[PDB]
Structure 1
Amino acid sequence: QYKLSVVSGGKPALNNLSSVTGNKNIARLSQDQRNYIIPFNNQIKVYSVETRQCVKTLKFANNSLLSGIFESIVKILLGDITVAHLITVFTNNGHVIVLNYKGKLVESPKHFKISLADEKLANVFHSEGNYRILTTFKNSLQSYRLYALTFDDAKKQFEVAHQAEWHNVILSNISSNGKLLAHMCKDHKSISVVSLFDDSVNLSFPLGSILSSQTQSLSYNTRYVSSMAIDNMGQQLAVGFASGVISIVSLADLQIRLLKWHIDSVLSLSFSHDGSYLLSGGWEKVMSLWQLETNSQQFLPRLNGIIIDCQVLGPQGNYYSLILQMTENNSNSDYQFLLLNASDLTSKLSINGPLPVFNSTIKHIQQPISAMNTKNSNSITSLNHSKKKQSRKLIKSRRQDFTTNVEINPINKNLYFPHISAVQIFDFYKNEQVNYQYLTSGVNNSMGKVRFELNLQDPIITDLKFTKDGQWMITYEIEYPPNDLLSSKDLTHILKFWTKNDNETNWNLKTKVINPHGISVPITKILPSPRSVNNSQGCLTADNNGGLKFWSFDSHESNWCLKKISLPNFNHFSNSVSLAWSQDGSLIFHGFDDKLQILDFDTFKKFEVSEFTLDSEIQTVKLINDTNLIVATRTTLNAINLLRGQVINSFDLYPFVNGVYKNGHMDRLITCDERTGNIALVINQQLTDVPTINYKSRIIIFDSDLSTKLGNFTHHEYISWIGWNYDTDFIFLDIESTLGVVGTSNSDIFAEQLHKL
């Protein structure tokens, strides 16, 4: 009956290799420069630049060869190497695949396989029929080897010939033309530049000669290189430091030139084709074009994130391609590819995948390097310790929630992600983002935080929900005070009511309540009201103190107001509260700590059994149908008939869910259809011979009262969230940012010739 299938996309792919800098971006612009090819973790998207839409999509799942192969793409080359819309994809392992865009994907592409002996392919490139490849072989520093690639027609094979070798490569970069390679090695350190197709350029010099003496006096940040760029001619080499100082070195005589604007570490450096301009970017969220003739600079500020990579992409520098990071989300690295028009510095094409915020960091994600160690960044020293600590936490520790809140708009079916201080509206049918809106005050895009400013925490959008009608949006926010003050511990809880007409795309804030429920008391739960009561224009908010507040929209006031309250000043605290409302609206089921209460809505007090005790704390209360109520506790789940007040089924959850999730996240793991039945989702770590990073999730469809299992499905990755679309199908979000769904003649010759001409 039911079936599982992936629907939407995932994160854009990057060359996630530590040493290579300035070559992180793999997307390419066609020779006609009419469309941009971007590889994703699960597909390849071809976007038309002129119209800013995804003209074509090549999904790995659809093609058998790509499905078996997909390992990550290390490069894309326009045309076919062996031989007008062909592309050659080189993966890290060595699979060379010739695909076609602008057409229908062929089920038998020209698959090949380069022969590498314990080598990981890192980069490939060409100038005119001559091809070289760079490969990685193994002090925590990887060494590199340079081969020459040629295709022999007779054997139809790729032959590799040794050309060069370098050891202990710390940092690397390739010129814009793709014919020079600059690299820093520990043979403290030395920089060497080599011509790649020729022997014309071959130079090396210690970094000590470049470094200023004052740097030798100062801390290590001054002597730490974070970025490196090499000019096409090889006459200039720009070195960027963690201090934020750029030094252009003239290779002929090693003369230095200091350019100092970046207050924090510079992350991206790139030369123009003629070499007269220098793109720089870093934590400032501002892209600076240094005019080297007069040392001037032009700025493009208030970008969406910190700039990881900069490039001038065109025969005449028509476009600038940037990679943005959005360091607010510590759980995941949120990359965004931005193609700007050089003429007027307007976004010609902005591309990014879904941006969920998980509870904790996942897999091997490491924050970018900064001048100082902060919550959003790592210092130079903190990197290795943080990596080791992350791996040890993922292995040894038992708290492995990685659960994210997501909402679905009933009217539009758009998918709302509560990013930190902002909401991302993402359309999973088209697999494109539709909006990004700031829903809080704070330092969000006023300026780029640097150094100690980076320790500030913007307001966090904790809960985001829609009414049944779908015309109102309720948002709950927590504002964190700055540190080192008397009022550095008094968090401010805010509730906001937003409204929006269907035609427009921007929500307009209508009411704002500061410190609802009192001062420093969280709104642990929110439940929009059913259609019966006030035509779905009311909501309930519940605390960790057992207090309940019912707000509704009054036409006379024209704004929301607190219609009802029950503020029992319980003396104990617990974040394990869940809340359900009957479809008719007569009764409200409030589960606090271990006890469930049935409150009559009219008097907003207990009915006149109302009290039901559970073995452990309640995580979720839901009523699949008016008759039956499913109650989940930390040790089990139970189905109760409200009519009989008796338990029908009880399923033990302790073996799988003991302390893996914090209280309240089982709510976002469990969802229920209003017609057919509910759905339970259980993730298990996979280990063979100590726990391993990889995870496996199981989804189980349950009928009302949980008598039978309609379906049992398994997915091969940790599923962060699962909810019920307003159609019969369920949508689940996976930590790979993947949204899957579980659901049920002479004239003819002359015409051809004229078309050719």
Structure 2
Amino acid sequence: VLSLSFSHDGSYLLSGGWEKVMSLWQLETNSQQFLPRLNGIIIDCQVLGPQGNYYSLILQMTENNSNSDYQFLLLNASDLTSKLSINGPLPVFNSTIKHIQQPISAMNTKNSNSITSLNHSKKKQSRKLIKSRRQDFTTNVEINPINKNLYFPHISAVQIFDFYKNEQVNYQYLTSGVNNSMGKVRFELNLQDPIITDLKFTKDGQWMITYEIEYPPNDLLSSKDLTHILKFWTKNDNETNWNLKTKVINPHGISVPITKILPSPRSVNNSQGCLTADNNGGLKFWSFDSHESNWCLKKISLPNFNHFSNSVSLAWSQDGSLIFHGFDDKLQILDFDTFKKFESLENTKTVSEFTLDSEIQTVKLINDTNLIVATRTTLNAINLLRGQVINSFDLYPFVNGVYKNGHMDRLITCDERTGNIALVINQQLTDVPTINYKSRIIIFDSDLSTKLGNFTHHEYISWIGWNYDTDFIFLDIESTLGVVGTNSDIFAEQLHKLND
């Protein structure tokens, strides 16, 4: 029982269980009437009314594991309607933040804790956060290029939130889940939910692309494989619910994670194309047929490599022709029209295959003049006019193991007009690393010769993305969205003033 509450006189009992249902018990005849699903579990509830117009209640959002995100809800008790709903923006992090404690229950899972495990897990997390040199907090955050909303991918859910008004405007599920069909209790709690992991937009904004993985239950024959599903959605320019238009089971053979997804430029098909690359080396170009109604394979290239990189990336020229396919450590440049390596008649040492030092994290092109590559130790800026490196920057002080391979993508972003944005993050030590954090931001030019601007921020920064209207937005660990960018009169007042 996570919340108990009494009515004002002493005849009704508000009960606050885990199962997502708030129950009113009329004591006198001993009967119950209850509200069934409330978007999570209810930590708190009570009655505020002068007679009882309003219930106040506080939600946990227990589906999110890494960061306990609470939400305030105020219910008119006549209809039991949601007279007021307040919530801050909801991210999800790779790893759990500084000292949050998942609530108590009856059993243990990866979403809850029993009592002994609760205390021991508090101590365990604090000790591991001091000890382990791996941690990162790298989330994916999107921007609506015609609505300027932020699309936070929750697990099995999406939060559309704008920061001009600082108020949540939509919440949705996008997954064949168990999202509202039943509040989970014990073994249903040990069950895990299908996770959205990749979400991107087409540049026209009228085609949303997403990619969610789904897990099996425990201890069955088919609990060995996972299942990846690709999805294409639309919406109009005025609605605020997304309609699913194409769902694809198991891209790239079976049980193969789609690893990197890419929204095509305007020039190809009015931004109606996407690139999907698996973890072995394949490329696929899907798009939208308009004499069909749908999305299809436009082109493939599937080598059968029996080595696997967890870390891939790819980028696309603005004239729709040069596809920079970055596998681990050995980039390629391909012509789009055949998906094969750029075979030159000139052969002037701007050859299609490149080798760098270590595993490549993120490539971009700032224009068709410079390719910007980030590996696991350094950052390099290379020309396209000539097959030769230009600028080098040492980073193996900072990016040591502090990022799981593939997340500097959601660190580094850039404008398309001036420069690129680099990130450094350091935990503020004492003499032993303490819990607290600190962050440094660099603003580079296209040549990467001079830092166009340096900045410091006193807390851990998770993600910087670029606004299409030429600025930068960023998410902080304490979820504070910040920006980097450019007679008569006296009588009049008295009239407004107005047992035997």
1:625-652 Cα offsets, whole Å, 9 max, x none, are: 1110000000100000011121111101
For the Cα contact (< 8 Å) 2:213–2:226, is it kept in 1?
Answer: yes
- Selected match of 1:623 from 335, 346, 365: 365
Distance 1:361 1:576 in 2: 22
Q: SS at the partner of 1:697?
A: strand
Q: SS at the partner of 2:270?
A: helix
1:582-611 Cα offsets, whole Å, 9 max, x none, are: 01111100110111000110111111x111
1:330-371 Cα offsets, whole Å, 9 max, x none, are: 110110000000001000100000100000000001111010
Q: Can you give the 5+ residue segments of structure 2 that lack an aligned partner in the other structure?
A: 343-350
Residue 738 (structure 1) shift? 1.0
Q: SS at the partner of 2:126?
A: helix
1:459-486 Cα offsets, whole Å, 9 max, x none, are: 1000000011111100001010000100
The answer as to 2:486 corresponding to 1:751 is no
Residue 302 (structure 1) shift? 1.0
Most deviating of 674-683 and 746-755? 746-755
Distance 1:719 1:417 in 2: 16
1:677-718 Cα offsets, whole Å, 9 max, x none, are: 110111111111200110001000000021110111011111
Residue 540 (structure 1) shift? 0.2
For the Cα contact (< 8 Å) 1:595–1:611, is it kept in 2?
Answer: yes
1:208-244 Cα offsets, whole Å, 9 max, x none, are: xxxxxxxxxxxxxxxxxxxxxxxxxxxxxxxxxxxxx
1:188-211 Cα offsets, whole Å, 9 max, x none, are: xxxxxxxxxxxxxxxxxxxxxxxx
For the Cα contact (< 8 Å) 2:18–2:41, is it kept in 1?
Answer: yes
For the Cα contact (< 8 Å) 1:670–1:681, is it kept in 2?
Answer: yes
1:46-86 Cα offsets, whole Å, 9 max, x none, are: xxxxxxxxxxxxxxxxxxxxxxxxxxxxxxxxxxxxxxxxx
Residue 291 (structure 1) shift? 0.7
Equivalence for 2:207: 472
- For residues 524-535 of structure 1, what are the structure 2 equivalents within 5 Å? 524-535=259-270
Distance 1:283 1:634 in 2: 43
1:73-100 Cα offsets, whole Å, 9 max, x none, are: xxxxxxxxxxxxxxxxxxxxxxxxxxxx
Distance 1:489 1:324 in 2: 34
1:428-482 Cα offsets, whole Å, 9 max, x none, are: 1110111011000111111100011101111100000001111110000101000
Equivalence for 1:706: 448
Residue 403 (structure 1) shift? 1.1
Higher radius of gyration, 1 or 2: 1
TM-score by length of 1: 0.64
Residue 658 (structure 1) shift? 0.8
RMSD of aligned Cα (Å): 0.7
TM-score by length of 2: 0.97
The answer as to 2:61 corresponding to 1:361 is no
Q: SS at the partner of 1:304?
A: coil
For the Cα contact (< 8 Å) 1:630–1:705, is it kept in 2?
Answer: no
1:653-681 Cα offsets, whole Å, 9 max, x none, are: 11000101111110000001111111011
Percentage of pairs with the same residue: 100
Equivalence for 2:323: 588
Distance 2:371 2:431 in 1: 41
Equivalence for 1:646: 388
For the Cα contact (< 8 Å) 1:725–1:731, is it kept in 2?
Answer: yes
Distance 1:473 1:378 in 2: 37
Residue 720 (structure 1) shift? 0.8
For the Cα contact (< 8 Å) 2:373–2:379, is it kept in 1?
Answer: yes
1:144-186 Cα offsets, whole Å, 9 max, x none, are: xxxxxxxxxxxxxxxxxxxxxxxxxxxxxxxxxxxxxxxxxxx
Distance 1:644 1:445 in 2: 56
- Selected match of 2:4 from 240, 252, 269: 269
For the Cα contact (< 8 Å) 2:279–2:309, is it kept in 1?
Answer: yes
For the Cα contact (< 8 Å) 1:355–1:419, is it kept in 2?
Answer: yes
Residue 502 (structure 1) shift? 1.0
1:535-587 Cα offsets, whole Å, 9 max, x none, are: 11000011111111100101011101011000011110111101100011111
Equivalence for 2:108: 373
Distance 2:146 2:305 in 1: 39
Distance 1:653 1:502 in 2: 44
For the Cα contact (< 8 Å) 2:22–2:34, is it kept in 1?
Answer: yes
Residue 751 (structure 1) shift? 1.2
Q: SS at the partner of 1:494?
A: strand
1:276-312 Cα offsets, whole Å, 9 max, x none, are: 0010112101000011001111110111110000101
For the Cα contact (< 8 Å) 2:108–2:190, is it kept in 1?
Answer: no
Residue 329 (structure 1) shift? 0.9
Q: SS at the partner of 2:3?
A: strand
Q: SS at the partner of 1:613?
A: coil
For the Cα contact (< 8 Å) 2:2–2:44, is it kept in 1?
Answer: yes
For the Cα contact (< 8 Å) 2:61–2:69, is it kept in 1?
Answer: yes
- Selected match of 2:160 from 425, 431, 440: 425
Distance 2:423 2:453 in 1: 12
Q: Can you give the 5+ residue segments of structure 1 that lack an aligned partner in the other structure?
A: 1-265
Q: SS at the partner of 1:532?
A: helix
Residue 423 (structure 1) shift? 0.4
- Selected match of 1:516 from 251, 267, 278: 251
Distance 2:262 2:31 in 1: 56
Distance 1:325 1:630 in 2: 42
Residue 415 (structure 1) shift? 0.2
For the Cα contact (< 8 Å) 1:577–1:592, is it kept in 2?
Answer: yes
The answer as to 2:271 corresponding to 1:536 is yes
Residue 752 (structure 1) shift? 1.3
For the Cα contact (< 8 Å) 2:209–2:231, is it kept in 1?
Answer: yes
Distance 1:366 1:595 in 2: 43
For the Cα contact (< 8 Å) 1:680–1:702, is it kept in 2?
Answer: yes
Bigger proportion of residues as strand: 1
Residue 384 (structure 1) shift? 1.2
Distance 1:674 1:462 in 2: 26
For the Cα contact (< 8 Å) 2:311–2:328, is it kept in 1?
Answer: yes
Q: SS at the partner of 1:748?
A: helix
Equivalence for 2:20: 285
Q: SS at the partner of 1:361?
A: coil
Distance 1:725 1:664 in 2: 22
Equivalence for 2:75: 340
Equivalence for 2:194: 459
Equivalence for 1:506: 241
1:317-340 Cα offsets, whole Å, 9 max, x none, are: 110001001111111011000000
Distance 2:282 2:480 in 1: 37
For the Cα contact (< 8 Å) 1:321–1:340, is it kept in 2?
Answer: yes
1:251-290 Cα offsets, whole Å, 9 max, x none, are: xxxxxxxxxxxxxxx1000111101001011210100001
Residue 314 (structure 1) shift? 1.1
Runs ≥4 in structure 1, deviation > 6 angstroms?
A: none
Q: SS at the partner of 1:568?
A: coil
Distance 1:282 1:519 in 2: 40
Distance 2:219 2:14 in 1: 37
Distance 1:696 1:591 in 2: 31
- For residues 225-374 of structure 1, what are the structure 2 equivalents within 5 Å? 266-374=1-109
Distance 1:577 1:422 in 2: 25
Q: SS at the partner of 1:702?
A: strand
For the Cα contact (< 8 Å) 2:66–2:97, is it kept in 1?
Answer: yes
Instruction: Name the count of aligned residue pairs.
Output: 490
Distance 2:265 2:110 in 1: 40
For the Cα contact (< 8 Å) 2:315–2:324, is it kept in 1?
Answer: yes
Distance 2:388 2:473 in 1: 32
For the Cα contact (< 8 Å) 2:67–2:100, is it kept in 1?
Answer: yes
Distance 2:394 2:311 in 1: 19
Residue 393 (structure 1) shift? 1.1
- Selected match of 2:293 from 546, 555, 558: 558
Distance 1:658 1:752 in 2: 69
